[PDB]
Design a protein around this ligand. Structure first.
Ligand code: HEM
Ligand SMILES: N=C(Nc1ccc(CCNCc2cccc(NC(=N)c3ccoc3)c2)cc1)c1ccoc1
Ligand SMILES: C[C@H](O)[C@H](O)[C@H]1CNc2nc(N)[nH]c(=O)c2N1
Ligand SMILES: OC[C@@H](O)[C@H](O)[C@@H](O)CO
Ligand SMILES: [Zn+2]
Length: 409
């Protein structure tokens, strides 16, 4: 029965949800691994407790725990796991599982929206083209002409493991990254390997900074296939500043729709290796990390230059000064174009309120401070002063290796 405190408001919450936790954290009694980035085929013995646990909280959530349809469903799944050494979720159990995987995502600050999630059952898909068709429909729906809506598209579950549905892209919409003969990098340096994996598979690269990558779609373990998202479905914001007319000359833009496609969804012991999910951006992922990480677009050099800043000393804070202007520009551009976006002040305040609800109606809220606190202006947002317990609940989104490190080609 643990206690978390907010040191800006003295609000105290009591966490009992963590008792339901199950998986490992990495930490021990004598070492904390809270800042480690990455934290690290089935059998049927393993599968039933995972189905039981899941199906018990599912009927419990609709106020029908332990009774008739519950006992039937437990027996039903028990029998199918005997017969098949796997089983299939109902439409309603898939929707509950997906929403709760997001609800348990301790690194996600946007979880006040967890129940407002559109689930697309793509479990009847069989080919890369079908995957292409489902993904285009996801993009179109979730983008909603800028009025973004959250959605997940769920492809068939892992069975043996040699037949695995995978989206090889990191995000459905990501900009390309090309190295140059002179060592430097054009575009997004994060994606340079994947960009070349597509060029390998015959992609024809326009070789600019902001080239929307093609999709590489792997279906039932077969080789992955290239598909170009129709450009009309890829909504993009050109980045301008509401003071600096020279900011347009920077020629920056970003896509409106963040849609993660390399994660693994775990529902009731079942594994969905292809499950692209989308919401909207917090401003700082673009303005701070994408634009200003040294390993990414790294534009602080070229913005402070145009801001006429003393760049010879670190202590002039020219970096910080240009970081803020870059983020005023992302927000202003997105809002002027009516493309849903949230600022780190609005999102972290909403997450405090979300935490309030989760301790009220659930007994806790797993939360990773290292990831929840925004990468700029940490302590002027309310989550900096919020103590948070981190623990792993299920259903969950897990990391998974990149398919080209593992696919017997
Ligand atoms: C609705 C608007 C949403 C906002 C504003 C939001 C915001 C964020 C941000 C800023 C991060 C940190 C990302 C990073 O620094 O790499 C994050 C992480 C995450 N989000 Fe949310 N998100 C939203 C929707 C969703 C949805 C719809 C899902 C799943 C259905 C989701 C699942 C996750 C997961 C699993 C992580 C952790 C990823 C990792 O550990 O690498 N989020 N979110
Ligand atoms: N793997 C490396 N780093 C690395 C880098 C990043 C990550 C995780 C990044 N998740 C992207 C992500 C995940 C979840 C949400 C968002 N955003 C959203 N708003 C959003 C997207 C969908 O709904 C809301 C964005 C994990 C590892 C690496 C290896 C070598 O060098 C670097
Ligand atoms: C080393 C550290 O764990 C790593 O840099 C983390 C820090 N916090 C983060 N927080 C978010 N939201 N996203 C990130 O990628 C990271 N990176
Ligand atoms: O939206 C996520 C952003 O693309 C970055 O945070 C990357 O994780 C690497 O900088
Ligand atoms: Zn720890």
């Amino acid at each position: 029965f643990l206690k978390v405190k907010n040191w800006e408001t003295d609000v105290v919450l009591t966490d009992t949800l963590h008792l339901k936790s199950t998986l490992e954290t990495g930490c021990t009694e004598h070492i904390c691994m809270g800042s480690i980035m990455l934290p690290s085929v089935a059998t049927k013995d393993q599968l039933f407790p995972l189905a039981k646990e899941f199906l018990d909280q599912y009927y419990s959530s609709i106020k029908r725990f332990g009774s008739k349809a519950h006992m039937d469903r437990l027996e039903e799944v028990n029998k199918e796991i005997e017969s098949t050494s796997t089983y299939q979720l109902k439409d309603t159990e898939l929707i509950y599982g997906a929403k709760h995987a997001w609800r348990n995502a301790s690194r996600c600050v946007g979880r006040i929206q967890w129940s407002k999630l559109q689930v697309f059952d793509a479990r009847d898909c069989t080919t890369a083209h079908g995957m292409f068709n489902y993904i285009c429909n996801h993009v179109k729906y979730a983008t909603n002409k800028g009025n973004l809506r959250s959605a997940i598209t769920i492809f068939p579950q892992r069975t043996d493991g040699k037949h695995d549905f995978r989206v090889w892209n990191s995000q459905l919409i990501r900009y390309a990254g090309y190295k140059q003969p002179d060592g430097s990098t054009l575009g997004d340096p994060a994606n340079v390997q994947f960009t070349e994996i597509c060029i390998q598979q015959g992609w024809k690269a326009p070789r600019g900074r902001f080239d929307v990558l093609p999709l590489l779609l792997q279906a039932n373990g077969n080789d992955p296939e290239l598909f170009q998202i129709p450009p009309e479905l890829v909504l993009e914001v050109p980045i301008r500043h509401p003071k600096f007319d020279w900011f347009k000359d920077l020629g920056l833009k970003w896509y409106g729709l963040p849609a993660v496609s390399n994660m693994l969804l775990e529902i009731g012991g079942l594994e969905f290796s292809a499950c692209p999910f989308s919401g909207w951006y917090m401003g700082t992922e673009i303005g701070v990390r994408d634009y200003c990480d040294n390993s990414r677009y790294n534009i602080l050099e070229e913005v402070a230059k145009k801001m006429d800043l003393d760049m010879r000393k670190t202590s002039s804070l020219w970096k910080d000064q240009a970081l803020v202007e870059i983020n005023i520009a992302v927000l202003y551009s997105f809002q002027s174009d009516k493309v849903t976006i949230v600022d780190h002040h609005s999102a972290t305040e909403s997450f405090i309120k979300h935490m309030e609800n989760e301790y009220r109606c659930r007994g806790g809220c797993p939360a990773d401070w290292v990831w929840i606190v925004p990468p700029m202006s940490g302590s002027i947002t309310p989550v900096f002063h919020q103590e948070m317990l981190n623990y792993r609940l299920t259903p969950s989104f897990e990391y998974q290796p990149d398919p080209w490190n593992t696919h017997v080609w």
